[PDB]
A paper describes a structure:
SH1 is an icosahedral double-stranded DNA virus with an internal membrane. It infects the halophilic archaeon Haloarcula hispanica. At low resolution, the ~100 nm diameter T = 28 icosahedral virions comprise hexameric capsomers, each decorated with either 2 or 3 turrets (type II and III hexamers respectively), enclosing an underlying lipid vesicle and within that the genome. The two MCPs VP4 and VP7 form the crenellated capsomers, some of which (type II) have two and others (type III) three turrets that form the external crenellations.
The penton protein VP9 (149 residues) surrounds the 5-fold axes and comprises a classic viral β-jellyroll, strikingly similar to the penton protein P31 of PRD1 (75% of the Cα atoms of P31 can be superimposed on VP9 with RMSD 3.6 Å). The major difference between P31 and VP9 is that the first 56 residues of VP9 extend inwards, in a largely helical arrangement to form tight interactions with VP12, which continues inwards to form a bundle of five transmembrane helices around the 5-fold axis. The MCPs VP4 (232 residues) and VP7 (185 residues) are arranged as hetero-hexamers (capsomers), underneath which lie, unexpectedly, less well-ordered proteins. VP7 and VP4 comprise upright viral jellyroll structures with VP4 topped by a further small (~75 residue) β-barrel inserted in the DE loop (the loop between the D and E strands of the canonical viral jellyroll), as seen in VP17 of P23-77. The smallest building block is a VP7−VP4 heterodimer formed within the hetero-hexamer. A six-residue N-terminal extension of VP7 is strapped onto the β-barrel of its clockwise neighbour to stabilise the dimer, if and only if, that subunit is VP4. Key to this level of assembly are protrusions of VP4 from the perimeter of the hetero-hexamers. Secondary structure predictions, knowledge of the minor capsid protein composition, their relative mass and the protein size inferred from the density strongly suggest that this protein is VP13, and an atomic model has been constructed.
Residue numbers in the entry:
A (entry chain K), D (entry chain L), F (entry chain I): 8 to 232
B (entry chain k), E (entry chain e): 2 to 174
C (entry chain g): 8 to 174
G (entry chain i): 2 to 88
H (entry chain J): 8 to 64
The structure:
């Protein structure tokens, strides 16, 4: 006897762990979904249960004369659902924040091949700006961990590239992602979202303008009671 | 702590970054240079059913799109790379596509004609026929998405290991 | 099987282009001749992409009239046997070959043999600027969508071609 | 033994008539499709054979300092296909020509409710511009006339509002403008299209840039031989 | 030179411009005032079968769409102007609608629920429930398109003159 | 009815393609034998059908005093299928032409292994002289293309080393070349002879003395009416 | 557009630049070093019969012919790299 | 048809991998034994075939 819930950035319990990867290009644990006392068991079903992943990373720059443009950000940027111009997209490819003024920036335009962007407000010399764009490259998958901390086995031993999650309009029914495989938890067990990517990804930067969480990993699941 | 045992038929999609596929930057006017080069993964077997989509997101070095009158071609070859002539799956252009949505809505999902079946060493190649005026090919910025393994739409490709009489009847081409 | 499902365009050695003056419709704009050994079959309900433009790359006048019309082996039109007649302006060059909801199809089937000819006739007003099939082109049919339709091509098989030569 | 052709502005003969209406509101003949000796008989079928009608009228203005805007044009304008911005449309709602410079003009923007527009190029004082906007309100229908010149009657006396032809994306299947009724021609007989509305439609402006005919009538039909 | 006869069933659409319907401007926050008002055509019968679209292009005087909070209602009345409670066909909001394409694509189309029928003096009315913050209603710059008489999608509205047994059964309300 | 007849550099038809290869080792199309409307079909048969091939490249040098000798030529030179001294050979291994004086020049001596030679006379200091020697390494094969310009089959997919076409005298039965594989043409189709090689090849050098054509490809086939 | 089907037994030759054969320059007087190596092409099978010719054009960096007293040996090995003596 | 061998620091081929771990308490791959083309297969049977490890920092 079961119903449908979702695991989330917070999900059904304030024990879910959020850690970030390494700069040495080697796969790490992004997230640990640890099953709680409250529940009996958790089920995932690829090809039934949808999933959503808005990753978002961090860069920083210092200002001076002529800095209406920000560089190729070491990230192969992609349009969103094919769409380019910001205000029409499902979500912003990137956002940025001037720290000294302590304000948000609106963006003029983008160049995806050279991976550069063009703003409206020329920041001040000596000033600091943070940027939070999407993440580009990246290979993810699911891992199983017992109560002891031992790896049991990966799910569907075929990684998923990151950028499909950007390429598809994630909200449209049918277009949303359905990965492969199955997996089942027990009480004290854990499952782990693993990723390999070269750039560091973030969560929970205080200076974000739109929300207290920059990046989200939501997933649909079946639950027993 | 169960995972769920699996069938051998892994349903996936194919792209450049995988370690059985190679890219190559190309000039304008050779319809014979292999832009892409797939090979058998040394032990497994691949099956593309007829009725499979493509997304050949091909661009130039300046990021812009190629000439729509360009013709893309896909073709099977031998273990030495010599095309067999027959066994073609595709012959059409880029202008038919719409990179904004060519892998989203089935109304635009251009697809194959025939089936395909790769042994442990067979090869698929992808070719590009253009006039001179274009800004060539830049695979480093361009990519390809073959099939889908995520949607209620489209189809995927079946990877399998070796099951005995399956392979016995499969090698009878 | 012997049946091959393809498309057709200008850059093929069974097809001829001929740049056109202003408003001389009787001239053959394009021409398709048989391949002398194979046989072509078109079914009705088949798209066209007549990407016609000027020397300066701009689109022609929408009020142009276009015809695809069969001719005899002599090259003379039969009058009857037309497959299509519409205006350029009905189409949308940005997507006329892409969305089926914008695709525009034939109104009849068609069959071509080793000597038959198809012609393309083009009636343009006075003021416009010719037609240069160098910068313009055409693509007929598609073999990629589950929607749309291809064109069938065959070598000479006995009984079907025996039927086919009853025209 | 029949086939499908199109009758149109010019079509299969240089005897088809095109004239304009009057400003006093009482309907008139816009187009006359006369049948030739070339054929035997022509057929119309409402709800089967597509039809297309791009009406476009004429306005005139003199310029001066600050005359970037053009006033209420006595013309009820609609965004084509629902879409407001110009280049996203299937065709321009409006076009502009300076006669003094003798050149096309690009348009900046529109207000549809006020029925006003804003150009890009400020004109000169003493300068003259003409404008080719769509036609808005008005009522249309077909009509039949014998070889003699006598009314036989109309077809389906429910005049379609003119702006419907502007509303739908005519170039898309399933949305194309069909009508109700049928009619068959004979040799020297003539069908006509009739209209009534306040403003004077126009064809054949030599100074117009984008084509040798501003406004078009087209209609798929069936023919015997 | 013949036209071909017709059924009495004329398959049309309905709109403000026709000479048997009245528009009226609306203040802020009265649902009860009738924006639209059809009257019987004095001799003919109208029939709106089930599954019939609407396209209520309502705007303000300044061309903007009204607030989506407003609810639109269509309702039959007697031969004096008084509703029946029953016979309602539609009660929804403008937030449902896409003025850019509401009368275009069947996916976005909004159809009635119930059948409906009209004698020589019967009446239908439109009622518009609004908060205070709206910018009223401008009927000159707004309109409606009820039904479709052109498309291979949607449906039409039947109109007929009085024929004997047809009206014998049609007056059976 | 058929005949045995040869296609060649010019042969029956002045439409056959002759183009040059690439320096990057990518197998490219040396020659294209396109079939005309004149004929019906063609047939080539390895192990039956003779072939003949004199490939040759083009290099250049500048003159200085004492420079009666040319260095290694980026080409592994062979004798002409049995003989070392040019005057007794089927053809020269190489020829030299001074451009300033504008004349052919006599060759004196060779080191085939070191790929060097010595001439009849000393050029002027600052002059330019070009040389047309045979080709060395490279692998060659045959391919077919439909009228549609798309591939239809490699013939016997195992190329042959180029050097043998030098290292046998081609005009002697037994010594002539009979390859493997068979192939049949149609009207608008085209067969293509392909090569991969380090070096460039040439045709139609204006300064070549012995003819308009520095190199030659010929093949005997059967022809259908 | 035909080509003619083939018997399985393809009659070919062999040369240095093929992707199942490798070269390696040797020092002065090392015999145990294999100058040239050939390996199976992973899926096909080769058959050489006796009376098979050789053009073993071995030269130096300057290309001049070697000491003619040099000895050449050709030998099948195991799947590891060890010659057999036999064969 | 099988015999015994030793895989090791150098072993049957110089295609193995020999690297060092990280100081953050997260496992790594110290050694990688990759098979060559020479052999059809390699097999290790715990409880049968011994293993030796002399680590040193």
């Amino acid at each position: 006897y079961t119903i449908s819930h979702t695991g989330g950035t917070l999900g059904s319990s304030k024990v879910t762990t959020a850690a970030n990867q390494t700069s040495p290009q080697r796969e790490t644990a992004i997230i640990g979904f640890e099953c709680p006392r409250k529940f009996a068991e958790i089920e995932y079903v690829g090809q039934r249960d949808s999933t959503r992943f808005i990753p978002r990373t961090t860069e920083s720059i210092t200002g001076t004369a002529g800095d209406d443009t920000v560089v190729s950000l070491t990230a192969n940027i992609q349009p969103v659902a094919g769409e380019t111009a910001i205000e029409d997209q499902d979500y912003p490819v990137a956002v940025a924040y001037n720290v000294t003024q302590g304000v948000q920036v609106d963006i003029d335009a983008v160049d995806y091949a050279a991976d550069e962007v063009t703003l409206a407000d020329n920041p001040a010399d000596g000033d600091t700006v943070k940027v939070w764009p999407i993440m580009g490259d990246g290979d993810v998958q699911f891992r199983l961990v017992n109560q002891f901390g031992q790896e049991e086995g990966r799910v569907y031993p075929w990684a998923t590239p990151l950028y499909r999650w950007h390429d598809f309009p994630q909200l449209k029914r049918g277009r949303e992602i359905n990965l492969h495989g199955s997996v089942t938890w027990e009480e004290n067990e854990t499952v782990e979202v693993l990723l390999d990517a070269p750039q560091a990804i973030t969560w929970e930067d205080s200076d974000y303008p739109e929300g207290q969480y920059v990046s989200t990993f939501e997933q649909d699941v079946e639950i027993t009671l | 702590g169960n995972i769920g045992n699996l069938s051998a038929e892994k349903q996936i999609s194919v792209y450049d970054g995988q370690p059985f596929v190679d890219e190559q930057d190309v000039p304008a006017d050779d319809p014979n240079t292999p832009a892409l080069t797939i090979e058998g993964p040394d032990g497994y077997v691949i099956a593309v059913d007829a009725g499979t989509p493509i997304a050949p997101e091909f661009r130039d070095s300046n990021g812009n799109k190629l000439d729509p009158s360009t013709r893309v071609i896909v073709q099977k070859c031998d273990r030495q790379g010599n095309p067999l002539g027959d066994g073609i799956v595709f012959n059409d252009t880029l202008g038919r596509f719409d990179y904004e949505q060519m892998r989203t809505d089935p109304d635009f999902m251009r697809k194959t004609a025939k089936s395909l079946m790769i042994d442990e060493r067979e090869i698929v190649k992808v070719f590009v026929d253009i006039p001179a005026g274009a800004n060539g090919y830049d695979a480093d910025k361009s990519r390809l998405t073959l099939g889908d393994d995520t949607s209620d739409f489209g189809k995927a490709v079946e990877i399998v290991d070796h099951d005995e009489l399956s392979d016995a009847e499969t090698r009878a081409v």
